Design a protein around this ligand. Structure first.
Ligand SMILES: Nc1ccn([C@@H]2O[C@H](CO)[C@@H](OP(=O)(O)O)[C@H]2O)c(=O)n1
Ligand SMILES: Nc1ccn([C@@H]2O[C@H](CO)[C@@H](OP(=O)(O)O)[C@H]2O)c(=O)n1
Ligand SMILES: Nc1ccn([C@@H]2O[C@H](CO)[C@@H](OP(=O)(O)O)[C@H]2O)c(=O)n1
Ligand SMILES: Nc1ccn([C@@H]2O[C@H](CO)[C@@H](OP(=O)(O)O)[C@H]2O)c(=O)n1
Lengths: 124, 124, 124, 124
């Protein structure tokens, strides 16, 4: 409760579903994964692919992370992701999000043994 | 001194090209705009639109900034951008950048009178 | 059904009054113009100005439409309008609408030949 | 011109030697295989294995291609390869290469019927 890798799948993995359907998505999932219990998390990406496909990004294109660290990797291919961006109104506790489905490259930080994602840097 | 407004333009505006001409665009631009002076800026986005069109984003879709502030705005339209991301092997002061040209919505933070971009939040 | 231009006239023009005469202006209008016959249209603005005046906006300030298209135009001058949202006290067909009277710049999408309004985007 | 698989054979197979026999293997081979005709091809890998062994990789571990396509495959076993890279002082028409010999898993793109290597993607 809980490893960095577990924390990553907690915040960023949702393989239950293939894409985004209704704009209640982030609204509902941000609440579910305990992302709106203290403050409306401003931005959070969910990845709709197998855990294996996301984990494999750790052996693909090496790139610098946003903080300047160099343990980040961009997926070679597009992935099904849902970008969750808190709306301009939106007040805690009633957190509201603009749900946005897309097919972007993802960029994740990787570390440890096994060599897996531990943070979601960006989609591109 | 420098106005945040002008600082934004310097770091993120490239109205002269409609797109990135080559895969060397970023390497060129990151140095010419002096963003690799003290450190390799890991991420920097350039916008290939008029200053008017970019400034106009300030009256478009209001959203939360990455830091949670509420003065951010997402363009209604996609815009021509170039994402510059530092390579994994890049080492200051010899900074190197992957280039990704794309049509994407931009998210800028706005403030002041006139009410204009002063930070580049994200592209989606 | 209707041409695009005609549809705009029927839904948004009201040159027969200086303003909403009552807190239930929307409700006699949302009916009179068949906006509440198959539903309760959530939002609908009535412009208490000249059709020509409104059509002229198609040659004023070009601005990005909310949907990302770029054929939108903002009036230079303010216009008398009525904003129709519906009161909580409203389930179809017994429709009740929250009315509001104001002088705002309007934003319309225009197209065709002649270049005329086909959609009402926002009042600012 | 040659067919995909044949191009691959002509570019990447050297089943006649077990390893680069000297520091100048690449210089002679890049010449020999006509890889310096119009330009100094910046990097090229020669595999010191039988052809069928390399083709068999098309049925081994499926991985993402650097271009992001999904038809790439990583070899279960390490293979004898020679890495050839332009040496810096290399200048067309006088190309010059650094020869590096190693045991690595190759990654190749495969396509067609029969499913055969048509592009060499990386050595890992
Ligand atoms: N594109 C983005 C940008 C930020 N984020 C989230 O917001 C945080 C960045 O401030 C990240 O925390 P981790 O990097 O700890 O996952 C990530 O959860 C995201 O999920 N997608
Ligand atoms: N998508 C992104 C992420 C970061 N950045 C740049 O990275 C910096 C740190 O996040 C930002 O500084 P400003 O937002 O102050 O311009 C912005 O310049 C960007 O330009 N595009
Ligand atoms: N300020 C606003 C915002 C929306 N609307 C209505 O909202 C509807 C959908 O956004 C529009 O229908 P048209 O697109 O047919 O004009 C428009 O009639 C309005 O009439 N005034
Ligand atoms: N390790 C690598 C990486 C790239 N390459 C070569 O680099 C070229 C383009 O990256 C490829 O040409 P083909 O697509 O003709 O194989 C491939 O031959 C290589 O031969 N070994």
């Amino acid at each position: 409760k809980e490893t960095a890798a577990a924390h990553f799948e907690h915040q960023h993995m949702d393989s239950s579903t293939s894409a985004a359907s209704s704009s209640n998505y982030c609204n509902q999932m941000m609440k579910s994964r305990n992302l709106t219990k203290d403050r409306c998390k401003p931005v959070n990406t969910f990845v709709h692919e197998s855990l294996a496909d996301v984990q494999a990004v750790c052996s693909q294109k090496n790139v610098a992370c946003k903080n300047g660290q160099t343990n980040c990797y961009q997926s070679y291919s597009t992935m099904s992701i849902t970008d969750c961006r808190e709306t301009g109104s939106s007040k805690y506790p009633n957190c509201a999000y603009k749900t946005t489905q897309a097919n972007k490259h993802i960029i994740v930080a990787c570390e440890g043994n096994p060599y897996v994602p531990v943070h979601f840097d960006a989609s591109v």
